[PDB]
Amino acid sequence: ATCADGRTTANAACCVLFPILDDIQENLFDGAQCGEEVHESLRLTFHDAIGFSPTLGGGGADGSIITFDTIETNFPANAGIDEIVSAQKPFVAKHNISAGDFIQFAGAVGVSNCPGGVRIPFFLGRPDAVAASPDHLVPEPFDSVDTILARMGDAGFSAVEVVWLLASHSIAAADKVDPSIPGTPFDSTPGVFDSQFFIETQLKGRLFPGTPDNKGEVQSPLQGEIRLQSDHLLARDPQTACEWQSMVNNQPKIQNRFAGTMSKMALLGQDKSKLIDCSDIIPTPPALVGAAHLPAGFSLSDVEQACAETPFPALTADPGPVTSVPPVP
Ligand code: HEM
Numbered sequence: 001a002t003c004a005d006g007r008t009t010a011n012a013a014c015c016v017l018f019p020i021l022d023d024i025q026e027n028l029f030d031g032a033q034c035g036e037e038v039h040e041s042l043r044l045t046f047h048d049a050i051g052f053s054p055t056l057g058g059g060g061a062d063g064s065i066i067t068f069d070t071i072e073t074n075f076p077a078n079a080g081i082d083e084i085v086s087a088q089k090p091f092v093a094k095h096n097i098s099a100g101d102f103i104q105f106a107g108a109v110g111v112s113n114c115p116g117g118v119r120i121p122f123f124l125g126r127p128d129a130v131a132a133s134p135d136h137l138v139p140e141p142f143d144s145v146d147t148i149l150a151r152m153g154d155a156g157f158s159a160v161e162v163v164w165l166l167a168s169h170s171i172a173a174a175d176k177v178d179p180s181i182p183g184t185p186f187d188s189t190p191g192v193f194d195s196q197f198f199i200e201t202q203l204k205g206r207l208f209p210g211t212p213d214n215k216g217e218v219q220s221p222l223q224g225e226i227r228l229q230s231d232h233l234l235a236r237d238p239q240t241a242c243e244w245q246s247m248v249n250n251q252p253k254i255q256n257r258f259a260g261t262m263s264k265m266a267l268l269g270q271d272k273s274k275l276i277d278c279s280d281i282i283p284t285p286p287a288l289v290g291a292a293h294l295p296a297g298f299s300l301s302d303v304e305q306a307c308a309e310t311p312f313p314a315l316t317a318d319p320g321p322v323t324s325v326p327p328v329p
Pocket residue numbers: 036038039040041042043045046080139140141142148152162165166168169171172173174175176177178228230
């Protein structure tokens with residue numbers, strides 16, 4: 001089918017997303033960049049979608065965290081999300097697109113901007129959010145492994161799928177975990193969607209990067225990098241440890257797992273039999289940049305091996321002296 005602007009797609013109904021695509025790339029994504037806004041817009045996909053439970057309710061990927069900001073941005077777990085929410089709300093208002101449809105679209109376009117990224121299946125047609133998400137639905141970085149997995153599981157996710165989605169932390173920084181140090185990335189390459197997250201969190205912690213005593217934070221191996229308590233533990237918990245380790249220097253799996261597990265999440269509360277497939281609009285991602293490595297000044301001896309069945313893949317290390325990670329602009 002042929003859209004007005006000459007660009008083409010499978011379902012002609014998907015032609016509404018083209019100008020929307022161009023606007024987000026220009027006016028939300030700084031000129032289609034893998035920077036701050038993409039990271040927080042991707043986090044938003046999770047925060048909207050995970051508001052879903054067979055027991056407690058919630059509409060999942062329904063766009064509620066926008067239409068009900070005043071209720072949901074006041075969730076402790078939703079701390080610091082009000083930004084991107086206020087940042088996105090003008091577009092949802094402006095464009096012929098529902099709130100739920102916009103969040104998952106933006107997250108999908110954002111990831112396509114990151115080198116090493118993957119095209120995420122996007123479905124158009126989510127109806128308007130009917131009520132606010134309930135609380136206790138977004139997990140927090142100080143929740144135990146069991147609480148986190150039970151929560152994701154209740155929403156529809158196996159332990160292995162949790163690990164796959166946490167590949168998002170490879171293009172991710174924290175603002176409210178340690179507020180003394182905002183824009184502090186979860187690994188050394190927040191502009192590049194790669195395996196450096198799963199690698200560097202397996203490292204033995206060395207230091208607190210900002211202030212010593214923050215809830216949900218543990219020691220990090222790198223000045224300029226923050227490690228979540230939840231990520232620290234998942235990488236060392238027998239339920240998730242071997243899978244975590246399998247993402248190391250395994251880009252295609254990272255991309256593939258993430259692409260499929262995200263479409264599922266972007267569908268929580270939704271039926272894709274009643275949605276239109278507009279996946280062929282999501283841009284082609286830039287190629288991966290750099291290779292998987294230990295950080296400079298590290299060896300295999302600095303890795304805390306947590307997988308009982310398979311030992312940590314021996315990687316090389318950056319040369320020169322040990323350094324620090326620039327915070328996210
Ligand atoms: C499963 C348990 C999870 C926990 C405990 C957790 C926790 C966190 C925390 C505390 C932050 C930093 C917020 C702050 O600034 O204080 C963060 C950032 C982020 N999260 Fe997660 N998260 C989880 C899962 C996910 C999932 C499923 C996604 C899927 C997209 C995701 C995507 C992101 C992204 C992209 C950021 C970076 C935000 C930015 O740099 O603007 N996370 N996470």
